[PDB]
């Protein structure tokens, strides 16, 4: 049930991992600070960030509810 996906496209294979604090620590240390700054700001980049977050949080709640129906 692996954490590391393999994206294959156009004769290339890329390893994908979710970016949590653990996975950031594995970057070279000289890369980590900018990566952290990038990730911290990324969700605020697009105009209308407040409203987008309100929508996202509501959708995720609905997803959690659908899971409860199954269980």
């Amino acid at each position: 049930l692996k954490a590391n996906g393999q994206l294959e496209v156009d004769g290339k294979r890329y390893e994908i991992r979710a970016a949590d604090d653990g996975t950031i620590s594995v970057l070279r240390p000289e890369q980590q600070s900018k990566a952290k700054s990038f990730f911290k700001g990324a969700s605020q980049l697009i105009g209308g960030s407040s409203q987008r977050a309100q929508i996202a949080q509501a959708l995720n709640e609905k997803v959690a509810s659908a899971r409860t129906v199954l269980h």
């Binding site: 996906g5 890329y14 994908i16 970016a19 990566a35 700001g41 996202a56 959708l59 609905k62």
Partner: protein
């Protein structure tokens, strides 16, 4: 009420994760999915629900002495071939690479192709 059509992005992301044969990637409560690729690149997928588009956003790392004129030529790339763009974020002082995919055009192969495109663009800039 909640506009359930806005779960389209999650559904796609689930299908992408299944293709990648991996534990499902998720959007957080800001509508973003942060990823590290090849222990090297920082990439985020961001849902812009209001504008019906998915954004692919990457951290660029140009040489400190790449002339700003070169980066501004790069900035025209979307016009030239509908490929990724770049710009400066003034909050962070960091250069960002980006691609937008309208909801109408999203699919698992399109997302794969566009992510690889973005990555190779990032790769080119980092070593230019």
């Amino acid at each position: 009420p909640v506009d359930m059509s806005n779960l389209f992005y999650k559904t796609l992301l689930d299908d992408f994760s299944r293709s990648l044969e991996m534990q499902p990637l998720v959007f957080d409560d800001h509508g973003t999915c942060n990823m590290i690729i090849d222990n090297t690149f920082a990439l985020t997928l961001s849902c812009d629900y209001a504008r019906e588009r998915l954004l692919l956003i990457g951290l660029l790392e140009p040489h400190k002495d790449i002339p700003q004129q070169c980066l501004l030529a790069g900035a025209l790339n979307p016009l030239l071939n509908a490929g990724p763009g770049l710009g400066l974020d003034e909050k962070s002082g960091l250069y960002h690479a980006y691609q937008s995919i309208p909801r109408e055009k999203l699919s698992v192969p399109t997302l794969k192709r566009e992510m690889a495109g973005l990555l190779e663009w990032m790769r080119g800039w980092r070593e230019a």
